[PDB]
Design a protein around this ligand. Structure first.
Ligand SMILES: [Ca+2]
Ligand SMILES: [Cl-]
Length: 239
């Protein structure tokens, strides 16, 4: 099998970590070794696997391949997988909040990218009064412009992404075509402002739970910026 027991345990735990049981299983591991080697190596593997999912790979395949590669070493220390130095990208998948968590403890404060299309937004503008108020403000019949920003609870769409981002600020930018009737169409795009990730584990207590938050309170962290590049084209109409 593997050249070491850390990789062996990773492969054994694949069915649980690459599932909805990931958090509970990781909490149990962290409790067992006091956020020790196996826990740190698991967390780094999650971040690596998420990175690979962001690049187009299958999560479980990516996870298994990283564990297998760790398995080529006879060593068992926490550096048998290194948190890489370059451009980290969040996939929006199962392991994304773990990747963000990993980044606060291993990423040296470097910015991370969360492509807007990976977040899982499904913004219903008609459900946002401050935006609808601006839409339906003093406008000429014909074409006019809209460019406004609004807070958004990402949990409206993805409890998961929420674990990483919480609230963010979105920008709606485009043009409105309106009738002499008062019927209108908006065509444009949603963009997102950068989000500060506060890597203090007390900010993550609800998700991480009592024991893990306690264990991580002892570990150094550096907060960082999450860049949320790109645009989501959208169309909205009303009266
Ligand atoms: Ca936020
Ligand atoms: Cl070793």
């Amino acid at each position: 099998g593997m050249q070491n027991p850390v990789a062996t345990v990773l492969l054994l735990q694949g069915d649980l970590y690459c599932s909805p049981n990931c958090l509970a299983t990781f909490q149990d591991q962290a409790r067992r070794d006091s956020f020790g080697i196996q826990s740190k190596v698991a967390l780094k593997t999650f971040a690596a696997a998420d990175q690979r999912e962001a690049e187009g790979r299958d999560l479980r395949t990516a996870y298994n391949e990283i564990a297998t590669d760790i398995g080529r070493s006879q060593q068992i220390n926490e550096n048998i997988i290194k948190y890489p130095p370059g451009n980290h990208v969040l996939s929006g998948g199962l392991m994304t909040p773990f990747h963000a968590l990993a980044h606060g403890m291993f990423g040296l404060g470097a910015p991370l990218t969360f492509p807007i299309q990976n977040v899982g937004l499904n913004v219903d503008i008609r459900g946002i009064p401050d935006v609808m108020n601006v839409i339906q403000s003093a406008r000429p019949v014909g074409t006019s412009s809209l460019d406004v920003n609004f807070a958004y609870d990402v949990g409206k769409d993805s409890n998961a992404s929420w674990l990483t981002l919480g609230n963010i600020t979105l920008r709606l930018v485009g043009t409105i075509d309106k009738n002499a009737s008062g019927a209108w169409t908006f065509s444009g795009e949603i963009r997102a402002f950068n989000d500060v990730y506060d890597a203090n584990p007390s900010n993550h207590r609800g998700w991480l739970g009592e024991n893990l938050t306690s264990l991580l309170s002892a570990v150094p962290f550096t907060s960082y910026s999450i860049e949320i590049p790109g645009s989501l084209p959208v169309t909205v109409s009303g009266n």
